Amino acid sequence: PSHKSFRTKQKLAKAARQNRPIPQWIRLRTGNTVHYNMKRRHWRRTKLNI
Amino acid sequence: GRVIRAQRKSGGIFQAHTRLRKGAAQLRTLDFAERHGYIRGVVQKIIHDPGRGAPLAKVAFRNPYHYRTDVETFVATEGMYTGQFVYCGKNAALTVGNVLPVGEMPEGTIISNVEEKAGDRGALGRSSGNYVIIVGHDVDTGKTRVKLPSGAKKVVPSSARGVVGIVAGGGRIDKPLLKAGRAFHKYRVKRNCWPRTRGVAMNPVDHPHGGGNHQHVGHSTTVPRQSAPGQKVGLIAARRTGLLRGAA
Amino acid sequence: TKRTKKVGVTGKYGVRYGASLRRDVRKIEVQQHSRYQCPFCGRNTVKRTAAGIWCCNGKGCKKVLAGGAWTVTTAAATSARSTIRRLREMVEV
Amino acid sequence: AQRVTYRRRLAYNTRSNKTRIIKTPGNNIRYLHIKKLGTIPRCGDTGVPLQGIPALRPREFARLSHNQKKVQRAYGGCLSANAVKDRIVRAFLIEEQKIVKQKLKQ
Amino acid sequence: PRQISDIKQFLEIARRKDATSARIKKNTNKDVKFKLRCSKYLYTLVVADAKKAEKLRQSLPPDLTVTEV
Amino acid sequence: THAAKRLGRHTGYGKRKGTAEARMPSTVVWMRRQRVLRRLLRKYRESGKIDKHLYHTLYLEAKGNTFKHKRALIEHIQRAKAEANRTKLIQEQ
RNA sequence: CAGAUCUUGGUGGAAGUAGCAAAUAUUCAAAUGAGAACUUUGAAGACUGAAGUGGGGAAAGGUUCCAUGUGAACAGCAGUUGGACAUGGGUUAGUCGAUCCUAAGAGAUAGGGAAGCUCCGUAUGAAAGUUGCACGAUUUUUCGUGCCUCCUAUCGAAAGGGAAUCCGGUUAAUAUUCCGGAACCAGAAGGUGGAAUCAACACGGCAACGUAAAUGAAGUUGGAGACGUCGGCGGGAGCCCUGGGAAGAGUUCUCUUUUCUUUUUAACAAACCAUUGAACUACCCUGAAAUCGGUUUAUCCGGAGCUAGGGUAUGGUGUUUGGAAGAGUUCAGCGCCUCAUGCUGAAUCCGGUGCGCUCUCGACGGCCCUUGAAAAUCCAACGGAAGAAUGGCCUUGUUUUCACAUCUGGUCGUACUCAUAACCGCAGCAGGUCUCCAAGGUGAACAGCCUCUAGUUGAUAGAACAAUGUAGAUAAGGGAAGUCGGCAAAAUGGAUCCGUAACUUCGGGAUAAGGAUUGGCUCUAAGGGUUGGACAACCAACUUAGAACUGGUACGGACAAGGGGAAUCUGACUGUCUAAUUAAAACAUAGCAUUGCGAUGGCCAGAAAGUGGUGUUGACGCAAUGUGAUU
Ligand SMILES: [Zn+2]
């Protein structure tokens, strides 16, 4: 609400960083089948729950 | 069944509302000055205590042992005016507003804020318009018989203190409340006991009087004295019941 | 104009609460909202505040009196004052 | 006409959210948050406000000079002139009464 | 901002060490404002006479930095 | 339209939606009338046309709604002054 | 395995079917593009109509904010577009909050219970200790002791209390934070300087009291913080309205010296402050008042000292200035690839008004068996601890509660939505979610209706009006004959003037019932404010009443907006409940009555407790019941 604690802001920063597209080279690694990921979170679909 | 409202009144929600109250109305600590002579204080404030029908008197006293002024919270007697002098002790004059030992007062005197025991700092006759009458004295094993507002006779040690006069506030119960709002405002600053729902208007799970196709108690409302909580409702240990026309 | 045959101050209550209750309240409020004389200043300026406190204004005698619910002095208190005065005189003499 | 908004994140009309309309040198009508009004010190014996002392918040009195917070008199800035005079007369008369009481005792 | 009306007081406050810069402002009503930038306050003197303004400028400390806006 | 209303147009019974009190309070009208009457009474008293006693009587009468307007008050003052002068000249002999 | 309304998964007929219809509404042209009903631009027509579809916030969300690209999936139609996808960027504080304090409360510690998880308990039955002086010390200074005295854990509010910032400009996205200018607060140390001292720590006023300073340790006291609600009155700021001048724009068959936009002065600082607007508001001096006087819209004041005269204080959202025109705004020219966007010109002026709106202040009045927080912190007083110049002249102690000057002010939040798409409801759901500002006209009005600023034109579209529907209307004659039942609809409705019954608790009923009028135009009369030699030249105001004339015999012309009356049953009334079938005669209520209890107590609680509530209480009280106004 624009009035957030330091812990809340750090958690939001962590959530934002864990939302980026996956680089393709890691998926192309031999023996690595990361490929597509359903871990992607949208602000309007799945809430963080603090 | 279910726990009744009487059992639920053990605290919590049903605690007294004491935010706006100005302090306890204890007389004073029985010290050497009050035990051997008197001490003169000056009343400086007369204030209204919410939840109490009688005004309270803020009275300033000089500390005998320290350079300091002590303020008390006397229960104001009728005729008390700010700036007057009150005297507390054995040798105090028999004047309205003065605090004297009960045993040092003449028989038949009218007092207020009387102590049940020495040093109790006021127990009897504290409500507005109420007072205690000194019935008699008994020097041998010094005890004073007094008459309480309820009409009972109580024996107290002949060293308990009392305030000469009648508690201020007059007869407050002589005016009809006339409105549920007036009753609501009266009890709001006292506690959560209003309004009250009748037991016969309840269900059997709620009250012993609840249930039935008609609103009726079903059994006698006079219950024995040694009733368990939850069934001690109605008229507890009623010696008599009904309208009485003439008795002592 | 008279504006009221008998209700007087209780005209604010309309027709509710009953005639006897309105009459009793009318007497009480007439006593309650009355200017009284300061026993130390001699001016008819004593007014009630919060059911037992009576104060009079002016440059002097700003005393606050502990009185009755709606009268400065009650009959019972006056009788008690006379009784205490009598007892004090007997003890002194 | 121009309509204004609160300049702070307090969105309620509380006693600490007093605002005044100002016209800036840009033809802009906007709010200006202001503090509560000060209070003149009151007499300790009668409760009347004390003459010659400004009305300020409690912390604002620390920045004033000494003579602006008092009156050049005994009990100045704590009691009114009438209260001081009454105390002086009452003190002198009662001390005289004590002296005559002792002399009459002797 | 503070306003001065005494020529000698303005000269003294100009000769004071904290006085750093002076500004000359000419208005359409034939008035000249001398504004001294001190550490805490900006001091303004208003002069209505150009004859007096010229002598004030001459008597001002030449070591002081004075600019015209 | 405002000019026409100032001249006295569009002010009929069919153009009024609020009550007379709502359109113009009688309390405000009485306040203005009392202030006008008291101002005139003070002006006359400080000018010397009337004395303190006549001023006090007229002040109480104005508070009692004796005079409908300034003209009525002036006529009442003129009659009172004429009678007072008549008594003063009669008592000379 | 064929079943178990079997389990998991996949897939059918229904079926290209139901449907994608609330919230007035879109149209033309151009650009882009392969593709345009949905993108952008322009024009037109509209809506929200200031209690908004506007501008901001609290909670909640967390990057949705901005720029550049994309149109695989979502945007139940589409898409060149998006709160979608991808890549980067974006939140700058001594002054805004948190942080500090305390409220309801939470909760350690001592101690006591409990097998124990843990419970009670917060100066409690605790050896519960931080503040104040110099005893010693080279010498002009916080450490070792000397006897102290009711100190005390902490957490708990982004709406309570509180030290301090404004203006203009700037970005694609940040502004009381950045830039420019101009200020303020707190803390730390300590260069002047006048005052006074050849001896003590200033003067003035008959007073209220005033000043550029004008020594002050403990201890104590007082004040501020610090407080309800309603009603009227007066003042100020902003807005609204209005008369001129100036600049620009609109209309111009005709008329309109016309219509529309701008004409601005922040924090802070100084001097006045009843003048120019507003107390006799408080207090003081002279004087002593009945033939009592003064005085408010409102009835209060005076031998406890009126009226009157003269003073003192309270002092800004008031006045004159600085800030500050150098800013901003409007208009008009020159460079013309113009570059760091440069340069040259003007105006920004003089007046008025108010039962007007919002906010605020001042003096008042009413109400309470309701009297409407605490603490941190700051100030003042009583009191006198302590101090050392003297060769009549250099030299030091106070004055840094005078003025000026130096340094420092850490950490966390700051983007954006705040909702018919950024929160919750499975969703871009007609639901729900606290609050700030509120223009003009009509009108009593924050009603309804139209309009200005601002915003939007977003709710899949096209064609045609079949039955039956949903919503809105009308209808000759009859007028409830319909139906269980006047269900529904109609009818009445604003304002002014007449008139108003039974009954009644005398207060009501009552807007009872029942009648008349209402437009426009031209006038008349009355009700108020400074004013030149009892007169009186204008300016600036809204009402009320009446008359004539006139038209569709019409006029609260849209909107807005009581149907009324006669009886019975029941509940006295206001109020409350079965969220999502029952709002009632049910519950509650004041009133009335009964019962218990004087503290070693009544009632309630707890496993126990050196345990809790009533109880900051004391029979005019607490607790437990029944009935339900008044008579
Ligand atoms: Zn008195």
Side-chain angles (χ1 to χ4, degrees):
Chain A
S2 180
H3 273 169
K4 60 206 66 177
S5 52
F6 180 78
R7 304 181 202 256
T8 300
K9 191 161 163 187
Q10 294 285 117
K11 287 197 71 64
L12 297 181
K14 179 101 170 186
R17 193 177 20 111
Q18 298 192 121
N19 211 21
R20 325 192 29 97
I22 315 86
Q24 317 118 306
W25 55 274
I26 322 185
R27 310 147 63 250
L28 288 134
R29 293 255 297 185
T30 295
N32 203 346
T33 59
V34 159
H35 301 344
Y36 85 105
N37 200 354
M38 182 138 306
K39 197 190 165 54
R40 313 272 325 263
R41 169 202 52 87
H42 198 221
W43 57 277
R44 217 170 187 174
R45 215 175 26 234
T46 296
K47 289 308 179 181
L48 280 163
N49 296 332
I50 316 201
Chain B
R2 192 213 308 274
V3 177
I4 73 175
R5 178 190 58 212
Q7 296 176 285
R8 280 177 44 238
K9 281 190 180 184
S10 61
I13 295 304
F14 304 92
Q15 287 179 317
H17 313 156
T18 57
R19 166 180 63 103
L20 296 174
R21 306 195 177 182
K22 326 290 184 183
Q26 42 198 3
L27 279 175
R28 217 169 151 271
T29 307
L30 188 55
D31 58 330
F32 175 84
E34 290 207 42
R35 267 189 274 102
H36 287 79
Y38 63 90
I39 182 172
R40 165 194 137 231
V42 48
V43 318
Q44 46 197 24
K45 284 181 181 57
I46 295 190
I47 58 187
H48 163 89
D49 192 74
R52 184 197 307 266
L56 289 187
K58 293 301 181 63
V59 192
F61 287 83
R62 277 180 60 244
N63 193 278
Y65 316 104
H66 302 275
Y67 177 52
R68 184 204 316 152
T69 302
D70 300 299
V71 177
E72 298 293 331
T73 322
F74 283 1
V75 193
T77 57
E78 215 203 280
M80 197 168 267
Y81 58 104
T82 45
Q84 88 155 292
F85 289 130
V86 295
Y87 304 85
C88 312
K90 154 175 93 103
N91 301 333
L94 194 73
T95 309
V96 168
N98 279 12
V99 180
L100 283 79
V102 162
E104 319 257 29
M105 281 159 171
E107 328 218 352
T109 187
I110 309 298
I111 53 180
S112 60
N113 209 6
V114 198
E115 312 178 319
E116 266 163 345
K117 300 142 296 185
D120 161 278
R121 307 186 67 174
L124 317 164
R126 298 167 47 91
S127 188
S128 70
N130 286 114
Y131 54 86
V132 178
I133 308 182
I134 289 198
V135 177
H137 296 281
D138 156 79
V139 183
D140 196 14
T141 75
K143 290 291 178 171
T144 302
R145 284 154 298 111
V146 301
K147 176 189 192 68
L148 302 178
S150 64
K153 293 279 150 326
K154 171 176 264 299
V155 180
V156 297
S158 63
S159 59
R161 297 166 293 173
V163 193
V164 175
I166 305 185
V167 183
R172 175 175 28 83
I173 62 171
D174 288 356
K175 179 189 192 176
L177 282 170
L178 207 81
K179 273 203 300 179
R182 300 264 176 80
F184 161 86
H185 282 295
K186 170 187 179 180
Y187 290 116
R188 163 181 52 93
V189 298
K190 299 168 95 69
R191 69 205 72 83
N192 177 233
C193 73
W194 191 94
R196 170 164 305 205
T197 307
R198 292 169 291 109
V200 290
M202 275 173 206
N203 287 314
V205 69
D206 296 318
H207 205 264
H209 297 178
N213 288 334
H214 312 271
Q215 277 195 1
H216 73 300
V217 184
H219 285 87
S220 176
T221 56
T222 57
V223 296
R225 165 72 69 185
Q226 302 303 325
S227 301
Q231 68 185 181
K232 193 189 285 176
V233 297
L235 318 177
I236 304 110
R239 269 164 305 231
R240 60 149 289 126
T241 37
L243 260 206
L244 189 269
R245 324 134 44 194
Chain C
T1 318
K2 194 65 173 303
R3 266 161 29 186
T4 36
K5 201 214 221 153
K6 50 183 298 301
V7 291
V9 69
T10 36
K12 58 179 178 178
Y13 294 143
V15 310
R16 45 198 184 271
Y17 314 127
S20 297
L21 299 191
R22 273 196 274 109
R23 179 183 65 249
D24 298 318
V25 169
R26 183 226 310 166
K27 307 299 217 314
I28 295 300
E29 310 194 287
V30 157
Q31 287 177 318
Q32 176 183 186
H33 311 120
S34 300
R35 265 186 169 96
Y36 292 86
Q37 290 218 323
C38 180
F40 319 98
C41 79
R43 281 177 255 169
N44 191 257
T45 40
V46 167
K47 276 150 130 45
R48 198 211 79 164
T49 43
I53 286 166
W54 300 79
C55 60
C56 86
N57 300 114
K59 290 199 61 175
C61 72
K62 214 190 301 178
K63 321 276 180 298
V64 171
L65 328 179
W70 315 279
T71 52
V72 177
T73 313
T74 69
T78 309
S79 178
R81 169 91 49 159
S82 309
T83 305
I84 282 140
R85 190 232 86 212
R86 183 195 314 117
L87 292 176
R88 171 187 42 183
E89 274 143 56
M90 275 96 156
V91 169
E92 287 164 339
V93 170
Chain D
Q2 298 188 41
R3 287 174 280 184
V4 304
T5 65
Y6 280 143
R7 303 186 70 170
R8 303 167 187 180
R9 295 198 180 276
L10 214 168
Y12 309 101
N13 184 33
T14 60
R15 284 193 326 191
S16 64
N17 213 16
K18 298 164 63 70
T19 50
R20 189 241 309 189
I21 286 288
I22 62 171
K23 200 165 187 180
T24 77
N27 215 347
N28 300 316
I29 292 289
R30 67 177 70 156
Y31 263 160
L32 192 79
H33 294 261
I34 56 185
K35 299 295 179 177
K36 312 174 190 181
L37 278 315
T39 316
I40 296 180
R42 277 97 182 71
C43 174
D45 284 357
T46 53
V48 298
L50 295 171
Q51 191 169 1
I53 311 180
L56 301 171
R57 301 310 293 182
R59 200 88 137 94
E60 306 186 18
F61 283 94
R63 315 184 203 97
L64 275 200
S65 296
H66 189 61
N67 75 101
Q68 270 72 225
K69 299 170 292 186
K70 61 153 31 189
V71 187
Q72 300 304 319
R73 188 177 58 249
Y75 293 86
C78 187
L79 293 175
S80 64
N82 292 339
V84 170
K85 153 169 145 223
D86 287 359
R87 283 166 72 110
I88 290 158
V89 174
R90 161 177 279 104
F92 162 71
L93 288 176
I94 289 168
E95 304 290 86
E96 287 292 313
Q97 278 276 353
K98 296 177 192 176
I99 270 166
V100 315
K101 275 182 88 282
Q102 213 306 132
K103 283 190 173 183
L104 290 182
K105 166 199 172 185
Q106 285 192 350
Chain E
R2 292 190 163 186
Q3 181 183 6
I4 330 173
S5 59
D6 196 7
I7 319 295
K8 53 188 306 172
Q9 224 291 324
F10 188 84
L11 288 175
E12 220 50 38
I13 211 172
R15 288 151 61 174
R16 198 174 58 184
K17 193 168 189 171
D18 67 335
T20 46
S21 61
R23 318 164 190 173
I24 316 298
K25 181 74 223 307
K26 323 268 217 95
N27 300 335
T28 63
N29 45 265
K30 292 91 54 184
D31 291 339
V32 194
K33 283 189 174 181
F34 290 70
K35 318 186 196 194
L36 209 72
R37 176 70 257 178
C38 283
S39 179
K40 186 173 179 62
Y41 288 119
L42 174 75
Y43 296 94
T44 300
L45 183 34
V46 156
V47 190
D49 191 13
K51 296 279 188 173
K52 297 182 178 180
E54 176 181 357
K55 207 66 64 177
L56 198 147
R57 228 172 194 174
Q58 292 177 5
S59 292
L60 271 168
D63 45 327
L64 182 71
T65 291
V66 183
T67 63
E68 160 131 25
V69 313
Chain F
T1 305
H2 287 187
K5 289 183 175 181
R6 263 128 51 182
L7 276 194
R9 273 70 173 177
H10 321 295
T11 284
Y13 286 120
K15 285 287 182 178
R16 303 167 188 176
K17 296 298 290 296
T19 58
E21 166 174 334
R23 293 166 56 86
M24 166 68 77
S26 34
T27 325
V28 175
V29 170
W30 165 264
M31 160 162 47
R32 293 179 182 175
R33 179 152 67 94
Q34 275 305 301
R35 286 168 177 180
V36 163
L37 292 185
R38 288 171 179 175
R39 201 200 340 265
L40 180 127
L41 286 179
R42 284 197 309 276
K43 176 179 297 182
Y44 280 176
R45 181 193 55 176
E46 274 59 56
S47 180
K49 293 187 178 181
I50 59 180
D51 46 316
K52 56 218 300 180
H53 322 277
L54 186 44
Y55 168 86
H56 203 79
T57 302
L58 297 159
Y59 191 95
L60 291 184
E61 278 175 280
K63 193 195 187 309
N65 199 33
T66 285
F67 322 100
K68 274 182 118 203
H69 33 60
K70 154 185 297 188
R71 176 164 50 89
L73 180 47
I74 288 176
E75 305 293 76
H76 194 280
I77 293 172
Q78 284 173 352
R79 298 201 299 271
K81 281 207 262 143
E83 196 53 8
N85 292 12
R86 152 179 295 194
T87 54
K88 180 59 65 182
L89 70 94
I90 276 182
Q91 281 195 357
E92 288 296 327
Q93 288 177 334

